[PDB]
Design a protein around this ligand. Structure first.
Ligand code: NAG
Ligand code: NAG
Ligand code: NAG
Ligand code: NAG
Ligand code: NAG
Ligand code: NAG
Ligand code: NAG
Ligand code: NAG
Ligand code: NAG
Ligand code: NAG
Lengths: 234, 317, 147, 407, 49
């Protein structure tokens, strides 16, 4: 489907503190009031989405529905692809040149047959239960912005914090989401799945280079943001 | 200071800037000339009187009330309620940009204003053309009314009405100045322009000016001396141009402020220190007197104007 | 042009021309600002010449500090000096003053000057020179009673 | 200094600005984050069992701070030879990857592990590139890798068709077809086994004992570097402007404690003028504000050489608590003059209503007088009538024209 | 207009001009001030009545 992102998709442009001031910066942001894709009826006919300028992943999952993410170039043999798998108390981030199937799934970590690893970046796990993520890759630095806020996208305001940044640069042109089910469907190259579970919906929104004016309060958090090609008042 | 503005803690940068010539020798000289001119403009309008005058202890001039323009002994700062209202409404360390406070503070200008008020109330206009001559305020009003053509009888008879009208005007002018927030615009625009110019001159240091980075240490700690001497030259030229245009803007604004201060001193001398026959040089209408009031960056003249009204048709021959 | 070759000295000549043009544009700007200042000063001087030398003005300190009478100009290699003749009162004295005088049930006001008193006496004088004169009908006018 | 600034010898009376007062920093501090991810160099040099020369054990090292000093915790090794780099400045650079190749060889074959040299080891087992920029270390291991009966577990390839390529491995066990006779997996005439064994025994001399050799090769591809040397650290400074180098942020100033609670992801803060105002400490969680110390402008208030030579100094816009009567004013702080309590006529302007002059003796400093004091008696029945006149002359000088010039 | 006078139909030229700071901003602000002043000077002489 297609919905509208009224006033969400903002993050800290740089790791610097500001106090009760206005900062105008030309960065890569999601345009306010834009046409974002809301894939709620696609319960794994799930083509991979591009990764031109980053992604805005919003999730209202009940409990532990998303199991990880895949970001590749062509998902073929000898193709560097960054995989992130979030377990219960640990996360595994690696870059593998192995080929992946149509819809990789986790059931206990058999995603594909081929295996070839170059680098690994395990760290602290990442994951009314809104979870916003902003994934970008500039200057060879794969940056992620994470936020966990209670509550569809409301009319409130919530900034995204640069939690993790990985020093690796790939021509990422793919995007794969990982769901969870209890029907116990093994994936030795399987291309279809499905099970009666909670609501599953992954938002997709492409970023664009725009100039944003952010207001920093006395505590140094982003509370007000203004786009610069939306309304004449802005 | 070009030794610190252009070159931030660098000796070779200063040696290369000294090679450019004596740009700073004339820039800091023009800045000192502007400072001396601004310090002198404050002495041609407020320092016209030679001796400081005081008000009599008895606050009974004949029916008029000057409590809003005379200094209030309750407040430690010797100013008037009008001056206190004008002072509480004008909203006022770097890489080599300093600000010098003026010579005459807000207290000496207040004393000059009080002396001018005492001279124009008790003496009239004799305090600005020679020795001070004592004269009652109603007789001064009669003089000022006869100076424009109106006979003295209308004042010696209807004195209470004129006093009540003057008191009502003095009481209403405060509300009129407090109603419109843009009344003190001419005094706030100059401060805003100065603040914006200073903030811009400080902020333009972050601009790359075509170089790799704005800080000299990053350039000199990532490249080679033969390859990091043209990237520093770009920044030096950019900052020199940004300071030259700033000095030009400061010179233009200083000339404008000098013209405004000359006009203000002329109005102070021709409206407060005597009555003028000009039409709209001492107020819109028939000018009678003028009261000065100080302000952190200017002067407010309160002109008393006598206006006819309730005219009627008659036959003339 | 004698140490370096043409194709490598062109950049140096260009930089020298840029520097000498930047150092001259600022000089032209300073000359324009000072010329505007001198123009304003000359306009003010011409106004003072016309309103002080070629006639008497009623302005306070535009033709000298005090009461202006006349002005004499004097040339100077780059300016003009005005010598203003000023009449200043001095040796003032205290006297008793009154608005009007009530006689025969009518309040008479002076035409020119005011009523001065030195003790059981009343005379009429001007506002610039003490000249005691008897209160007559020529220098006084009736404008009602003293009620 | 005033004469040098004005370029003259007979200065006039007044205040003249000559230079600016700057406080130079005494020390210089450098604070970088802790060193946590020490690369596994101990498990490569102090392992339990090394592999053969042909099956040289290769380990990749990335995403860790490499301490090149732990390499010298033991020290009898004769071959600590670095090619293309210096063994001292290894901590002054960073590389993307570190490849560690360990292998055991004889004592006479240690010199063969070098770019360009040939022999029996670096031809069919482990060949180094010609433009090899790295370090080869080699040390004897007789006590650990020698058995009385014989340590025949280490193998080595002796025969092969052609030489190897830089950083190439061969683990084939096929019979070396020497002659035209096609070998059928059996050994004999013109069919020899390529892999032979070492007869390591403690009774050997110094040229045939087992020697462990490690080769550290640095790779600096276009990818961002993740292996940097150990960063140094220093102590903190309070109430003194020094040179700080907090995690790349370099500057000069005083680092004072404050209450500017930063966010966990940010390290420093910029003010409205984009100038850095606060910065975290890379060691302890505490915010430190950067403040410029004593800075301003010096001005000489000289009465002129015509009268005397006693001058006074004035620091403008800076308190004179830190680095001749000292007196603090609202427009600065002047030394060399005494503050007089009686207001006289202003001669040399200073600022904030203070003027200097020569009493005659020394430079004075007094509040400027706005004029005399005269209070006339205001009465509703009294007047002041003039009696005499005075004809005075007033001079008013005004410029008209300028100097017509052209370029 | 700085974007068209110096960087006419060139995006890279505009990106290079953007790093020069607020020179264009202060220039256009001064031009707008001149325009407002010229529009105001026509009301102090003719709009007195
Ligand atoms: C400030 C005051 O009350 N008196 C001062 C005195 O302290 C000072 O020693 C003297 C210097 O000549 O000037 C007077
Ligand atoms: C978003 O795109 C879809 C398909 O292109 C369209 O049907 C829908 O109207 C669009 N929504 C908005 C708000 O533009
Ligand atoms: C799976 O989750 C467990 C539970 O925290 C964790 O210990 C383990 O490291 C995880 N494994 C992977 C491959 O994520
Ligand atoms: C003048 O007005 C103030 C406030 O209205 C009042 O307090 C004061 O008594 C008045 N003075 C005279 C002399 O009427
Ligand atoms: C005088 O007469 C004219 C013509 O009728 C009229 O417009 C005007 O208001 C009159 N003036 C007064 C003061 O009534
Ligand atoms: C008038 O009298 C007052 C009070 O006695 C005195 O101060 C003043 O000097 C006198 N004026 C003249 C001109 O004598
Ligand atoms: C006041 O002056 C007049 C003018 O000469 C004189 O005749 C008169 O005697 C004076 N009054 C006194 C009380 O001396
Ligand atoms: C660095 O180590 C010291 C000593 O163990 C410790 O006090 C400090 O907190 C550490 N810094 C960080 C950022 O963990
Ligand atoms: C120095 O003083 C003498 C004596 O008064 C005077 O003639 C001369 O003009 C003065 N020179 C300067 C430069 O002030
Ligand atoms: C200078 O420091 C002293 C000592 O704390 C203080 O009393 C004074 O107010 C300071 N002056 C200024 C201008 O900061």
């Amino acid at each position: 489907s297609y919905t509208n992102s009224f006033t969400r998709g903002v993050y800290y442009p740089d790791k610097v503190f500001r106090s009760s001031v206005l900062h105008s910066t030309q960065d890569l942001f999601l345009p306010f009031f834009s046409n974002v894709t809301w894939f709620h009826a696609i319960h794994v006919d799930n083509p991979v989405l591009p990764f031109n300028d980053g992604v805005y992943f919003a999730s209202t999952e009940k409990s532990n529905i998303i199991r990880g993410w895949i970001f590749g170039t062509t998902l073929d043999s000898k193709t560097q692809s960054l995989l992130i798998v979030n377990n219960a108390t640990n996360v595994v981030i690696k870059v593998c040149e192995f080929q992946f199937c149509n819809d990789p799934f986790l059931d206990f970590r058999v995603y594909s047959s081929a295996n070839n690893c170059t680098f690994e970046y395990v760290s602290q796990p990442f994951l009314k239960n809104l979870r916003e993520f902003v994934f970008k890759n500039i200057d060879g630095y794969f940056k992620i912005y994470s936020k966990h806020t209670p509550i569809d996208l409301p009319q409130g305001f919530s900034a995204l914090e640069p939690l993790v940044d990985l020093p690796i640069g790939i021509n990422i042109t793919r995007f794969q989401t990982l769901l969870a089910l209890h029907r116990s469907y093994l994936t030795p190259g399987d291309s279809s799945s499905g099970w009666t579970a909670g609501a599953a919906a992954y938002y997709v929104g492409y970023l664009q280079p725009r100039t944003f004016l952010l207001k920093y309060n006395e505590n140094g958090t982003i509370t007000d943001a203004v786009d610069c090609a939306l309304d004449p008042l802005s | 200071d070009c030794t610190m503005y252009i070159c931030g803690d660098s000796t070779e940068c200063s040696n290369l800037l000294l090679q450019y010539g004596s740009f700073c020798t004339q820039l800091k000289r023009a800045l000192t000339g502007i400072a001396v001119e601004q310090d002198k403009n404050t002495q041609e309008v407020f320092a016209q009187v030679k001796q400081i005058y005081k008000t009599p202890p008895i606050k009974y001039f004949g029916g008029f009330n000057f409590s809003q323009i005379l200094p209030d002994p309750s407040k430690p700062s010797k100013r008037s309620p009008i001056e206190d209202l004008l002072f509480n409404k004008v909203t006022l360390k770097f890489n080599g940009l300093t600000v010098l406070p003026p010579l005459l503070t807000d207290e000496m200008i207040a004393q000059y204003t009080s002396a001018l008020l005492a001279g124009t109330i008790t003496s009239g206009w004799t305090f600005g053309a020679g020795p001070a001559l004592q004269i009652p305020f109603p007789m001064q009003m009669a003089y000022r009314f006869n100076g424009i053509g109106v006979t003295q009888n209308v004042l010696y008879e209807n004195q209470k009405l004129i006093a009540n009208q003057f008191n009502s005007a003095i009481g209403k002018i405060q509300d009129s100045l407090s109603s419109t927030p843009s009344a003190l615009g001419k005094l706030q625009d100059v401060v805003n322009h100065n603040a914006q110019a200073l903030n811009t001159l400080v902020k333009q240091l972050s601009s790359k000016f075509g170089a790799i980075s704005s800080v000299l240490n990053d350039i000199l700690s990532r490249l080679d001396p033969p390859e990091a001497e043209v990237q520093i030259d770009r920044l030096i030229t950019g900052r020199l141009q940004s300071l030259q245009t700033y000095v030009t803007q400061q010179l233009i604004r200083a000339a404008e402020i000098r013209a405004s201060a000359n006009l203000a001193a002329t109005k102070m001398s021709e409206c407060v220190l005597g009555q003028s026959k000009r039409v709209d040089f001492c107020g819109k209408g028939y000018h009678l007197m003028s009261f000065p009031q100080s302000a952190p960056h200017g002067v407010v003249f309160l002109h008393v104007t006598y206006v006819p009204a309730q005219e009627k048709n008659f036959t003339t021959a | 042009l004698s140490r370096l070759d043409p194709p490598e000295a062109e950049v140096q000549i260009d930089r020298l021309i840029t520097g000498r043009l930047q150092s001259l544009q600022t000089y032209v700007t300073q000359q324009l600002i000072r010329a505007a200042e001198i123009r304003a000063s000359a306009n003010l001087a011409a106004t003072k010449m016309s309103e002080c030398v070629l006639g008497q003005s009623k302005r306070v300190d535009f033709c000298g500090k005090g009461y202006h009478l006349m002005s004499f100009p004097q040339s100077a290699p780059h300016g003009v000096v005005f010598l203003h003749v000023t009449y200043v009162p001095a040796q003032e004295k205290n006297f008793t003053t009154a608005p009007a005088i009530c006689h025969d049930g009518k309040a008479h006001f002076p035409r020119e000057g005011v009523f001065v008193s030195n003790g059981t006496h009343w005379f009429v004088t001007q506002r610039n020179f003490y000249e005691p004169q008897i209160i007559t009908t020529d220098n006084t006018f009736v404008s009602g009673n003293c009620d | 200094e005033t004469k040098c600034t004005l370029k003259s010898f007979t200065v006039e009376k007044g205040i003249y600005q000559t230079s600016n007062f700057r406080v130079q920093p005494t020390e210089s501090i450098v604070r970088f984050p802790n060193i946590t991810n020490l690369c596994p160099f101990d498990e490569v040099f102090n392992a339990t069992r090394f592999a053969s020369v042909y099956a040289w054990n290769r380990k990749r090292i990335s995403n860790c701070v490499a301490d090149y000093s732990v390499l010298y915790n033991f020290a009898p090794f004769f071959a600590f030879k670095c090619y293309g780099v210096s063994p001292t400045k290894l901590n002054d650079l960073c590389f993307t990857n570190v490849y560690a190749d360990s292998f055991v060889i004889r004592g006479n074959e240690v010199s063969q592990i070098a770019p360009g040299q040939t022999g029996n080891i670096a031809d069919y087992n482990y060949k180094l590139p010609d433009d090899f920029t790295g370090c080869v270390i080699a040390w004897n291991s007789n006590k650990l890798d020698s058995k009385v009966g014989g340590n025949y577990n280490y193998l080595y390839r002796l025969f092969r068709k052609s030489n190897l390529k830089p950083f190439e491995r061969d683990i084939s066990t096929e019979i070396y077809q020497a002659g035209n006779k096609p070998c059928n997996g059996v050994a004999g005439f013109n069919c020899y086994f390529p892999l032979r064994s070492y007869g390591f025994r403690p009774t050997y001399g110094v040229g045939h004992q087992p020697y462990r050799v490690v080769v550290l090769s640095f790779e600096l591809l276009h990818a961002p570097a993740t292996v940097c040397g150990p960063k140094k650290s220093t102590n903190l400074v309070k109430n003194k402007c020094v040179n700080f180098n907090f995690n790349g942020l370099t500057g000069t100033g005083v680092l004072t404690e404050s209450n500017k609670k930063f966010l966990p992801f940010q390290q420093f803060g910029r003010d409205i003028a984009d100038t850095t105002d606060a910065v975290r400490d890379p060691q302890t969680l505490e915010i430190l504000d950067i403040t410029p110390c004593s800075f301003g402008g010096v001005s000489v208030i000289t009465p002129g050489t015509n009268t005397s030579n006693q001058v006074a100094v004035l620091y403008q816009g800076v308190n004179c608590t830190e680095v001749s009567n000292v007196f603090q004013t609202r427009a600065g702080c002047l030394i060399g003059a005494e503050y007089v309590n009686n207001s006289y006529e202003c001669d040399i302007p200073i600022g904030a209503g203070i003027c200097a002059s020569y009493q005659t003796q020394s430079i004075i400093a007094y509040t400027m007088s706005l004029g005399a004091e005269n209070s006339v008696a205001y009465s509703n029945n009294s007047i002041a009538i003039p009696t005499n006149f005075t004809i005075s002359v007033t001079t008013e000088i005004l410029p008209v024209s300028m100097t017509k010039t052209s370029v």
